[PDB]
């Protein structure tokens, strides 16, 4: 609460968000983004939470084309509660507020969604999001130029047995 935004859309569904503060600004963004892309974000959050196998089984892949289980292992490792906590604690008040508004705005659209622009309505994985979920997505993007390109390699790393 203390969340308010003015949204204007121009041609092609481009939102112009006006607010008095970062919380309000994030509120507008999350709402507008959800209108166009609720299902995409929900799916990528599942990925970044390491929950693909839970909802979809081991036979599928993420949108990055990694197998569900290896992907889950990587993201469970990457997005451990202590890593998320330390990351959050290093955030400025303004960024915390952007994130808090975004989650609230996204979740507002979810409460109201009737399927007009949302194809995954009723799916168990389409759920309210938290700021931690946005941290999960951020850290996923952060490692794209580093350990992210070695996700399969990390999962494959095991010590030798008794071999010659």
């Amino acid at each position: 609460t203390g969340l308010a935004a003015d949204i204007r859309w121009t041609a092609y569904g481009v939102p112009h968000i006006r607010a008095k503060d970062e919380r309000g600004l994030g509120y507008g963004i999350g709402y507008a983004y959800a209108r166009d892309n609720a299902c995409l974000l929900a799916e990528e959050i599942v990925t970044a939470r390491g929950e693909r196998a839970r909802y979809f089984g081991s036979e599928g892949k993420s949108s990055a084309e990694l197998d569900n289980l290896p992907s889950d292992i990587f993201y469970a490792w990457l997005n451990q509660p202590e890593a998320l906590q330390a990351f959050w604690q290093a955030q400025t008040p303004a960024v915390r507020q952007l994130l808090e508004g975004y989650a609230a705005g996204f979740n507002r659209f979810l409460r109201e969604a009737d399927g007009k622009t949302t194809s995954c309505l009723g799916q168990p994985w389409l759920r309210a999001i938290a700021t931690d979920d946005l941290l999960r997505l951020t850290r996923r993007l952060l490692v794209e130029g580093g350990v992210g390109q070695f996700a399969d390699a990390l999962v494959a790393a095991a010590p030798p047995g008794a071999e010659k």
Binding site: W9, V14, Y27, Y31, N37, L40, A53, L142
Partner: protein, 546 residues
């Protein structure tokens, strides 16, 4: 990705100008999204962003436009461990045996029966970070293993960094804000302002090693292969600490390439080296920037940018919309000579006719010559010493060039390559008189939309990556958010499109509306001012609170 910033000395209006042409996935966690953000009085910025981020990643404001391209700098180092001879779960630092740490994660797995099973997996970690295995290259045996230290794992500044960029006024202010925070993970930054400054920054998070440490700390055979690999059995090979760096172990901003000019700067995913050939960037850490031959996209851009003629907005737009396959400029003249030299060759007839009739483009109406050329180039790439003029460091913009047809061995192998390419193309099921746009599409529901452009590796500035799916090539990545910004008196003028449209959901009115426009290459106004926004006959408004 491509980026071009033009300054007062080269722009037609004497002001700044920026072309932003990022190449990114058409789906998933890196699908660009347009938005305009305003906190009246202190924030007013428009562009596009990645999913989940409440900041603008590439955009513009009243006096500034900026963009990014993936850099060639390293953002991690591998460490080769020397294993304890008595225990492959221990590793040596300065001859001392250290234990690996074992961290278990537990994952729930939905089975065939629909019920959940718990799977436990052990992640081994060293002081450097987690162990990684590439079977056949980076093994974990009884002698060695490899750990990976990612510099961006400690970069907690990334979101603040873009929020700060969003607040930047001009090029000098942008440079201060980026250099101060060093929050950018793995991209170059290019920008132009109203004053006509053109800025390039290779300013990101990069592992720091003092110059004198590299020779001894590198793994020679791996660095030779472009992997940032260090000796993990020597504590002196830990990333260097410098108090000026915003993060311990990363490179200080003063040691990273920056070029501030009033003519132009460009980047198409090569190193900082030839951002502007008039002022080469050199003498940086191998982990930062090296003098490697540029790719055909940068070579194409420089061939249009070099010189004394003023650059118009139209010029920069057409560099994208021309869909010129610049790799043809180096190869096709001699290939056609080869064709004319082999007119008796039945197996060459269709290929040679198609190549001779080809407009050297990746336009919708471009002939099947493009497809023949693509398959030839994939085989040409694997031939040894086939260039008439191989890469020349003294002539880095004009080499390599031509086919060494005067060498019989080369002539034989090039003709064979064309024969094999021809067979592969004809073995396909591409109907008679099919154009490139008949093949490369983006599926939308049950429908398809023809997509112009082609692979960046063939020097098409409008880079489009596609994969074979049934009877077509399905677009997966490439040209995405397009932004061309100028600064006339009334306020910034932004022109572009989001190629794949705002929404990934088939139910949305904005699922394919801009994709129809991208197909026809009809860029549109990106409205930024209240006057521009109010003038839009489609304008809709909602105020929300809780």
């Amino acid at each position: 990705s491509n980026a071009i910033a033009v300054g007062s000395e080269r722009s037609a209006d004497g002001k700044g100008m920026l072309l932003a042409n990022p190449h990114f996935p058409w789906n998933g966690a890196m699908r660009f999204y347009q938005m305009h953000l305003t906190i009246p009085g202190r924030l007013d910025v428009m562009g596009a962003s990645l999913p989940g981020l409440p900041v603008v990643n590439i955009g513009f404001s009243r006096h500034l436009a900026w963009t990014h391209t993936v850099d060639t700098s390293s953002h991690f180092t591998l460490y080769r461990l020397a294993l304890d001879p008595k225990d492959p779960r221990r590793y040596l630092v300065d001859g001392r045996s250290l234990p690996l740490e074992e961290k278990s994660v537990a994952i729930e797995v939905r089975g065939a029966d629909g019920k959940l099973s718990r799977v436990e997996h052990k992640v081994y970690q060293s002081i450097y970070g987690p162990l990684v295995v590439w079977p056949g290259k980076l093994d974990w045996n009884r002698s060695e293993a490899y750990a990976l230290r990612d510099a961006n794992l400690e970069n907690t500044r990334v979101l603040q960094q873009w929020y700060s960029i969003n607040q930047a006024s001009d090029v000098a202010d942008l440079r201060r804000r980026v250099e101060a925070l060093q929050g950018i993970p793995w991209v170059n930054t290019l920008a132009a302002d109203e004053q006509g400054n053109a800025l390039y920054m290779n300013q990101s998070v990069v592992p720091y090693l003092k110059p004198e440490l590299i020779p001894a700390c590198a793994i020679p055979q791996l660095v030779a292969e472009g992997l940032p690999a260090l000796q993990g059995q020597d504590s002196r090979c830990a990333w260097s600490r410098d108090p000026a760096a915003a993060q311990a172990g990363i490179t200080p901003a003063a040691q990273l390439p920056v070029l501030l000019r009033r003519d132009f700067v460009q980047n198409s995913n090569d190193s900082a080296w030839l951002t502007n050939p008039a002022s080469p960037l050199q003498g940086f850490s191998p982990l930062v920037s090296q003098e490697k031959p540029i790719g055909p996209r940068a070579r194409y851009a420089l061939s249009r940018l070099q010189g004394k003629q003023p650059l118009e907005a139209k010029t920069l737009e057409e560099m994208v919309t021309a869909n010129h396959v610049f790799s043809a400029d180096q190869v096709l003249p001699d290939l056609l000579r080869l064709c004319r030299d082999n007119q008796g060759e039945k197996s060459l007839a269709r290929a040679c006719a198609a190549l001779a009739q080809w407009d050297r483009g990746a336009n919708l109406d471009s002939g099947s010559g493009f497809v023949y050329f693509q398959r030839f180039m994939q085989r040409f790439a694997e031939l040894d010493g086939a260039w008439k003029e191989p890469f020349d460091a003294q002539r880095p913009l004009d080499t390599p060039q031509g086919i060494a047809l005067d060498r019989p061995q080369v002539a034989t192998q090039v003709r064979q390559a064309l024969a094999d390419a021809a067979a592969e193309v004809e073995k396909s099921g591409i109907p008679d008189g099919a154009r490139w746009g008949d093949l490369q599409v983006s599926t939308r529901g049950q429908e398809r939309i023809a997509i112009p452009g082609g692979d960046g590796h063939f020097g098409v500035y409008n880079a489009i990556q596609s994969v074979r799916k049934g009877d077509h090539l399905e677009v997966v990545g490439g040209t995405s958010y397009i932004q061309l910004v100028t600064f006339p008196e009334e306020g910034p003028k932004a022109r572009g499109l989001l190629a794949f449209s705002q929404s990934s959901d088939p139910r949305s009115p904005h699922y394919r509306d801009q994709t129809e426009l991208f197909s026809r290459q009809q860029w549109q106004t990106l409205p930024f001012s209240d006057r521009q926004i109010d003038a839009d006959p489609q304008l809709q408004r909602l105020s929300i609170r809780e």
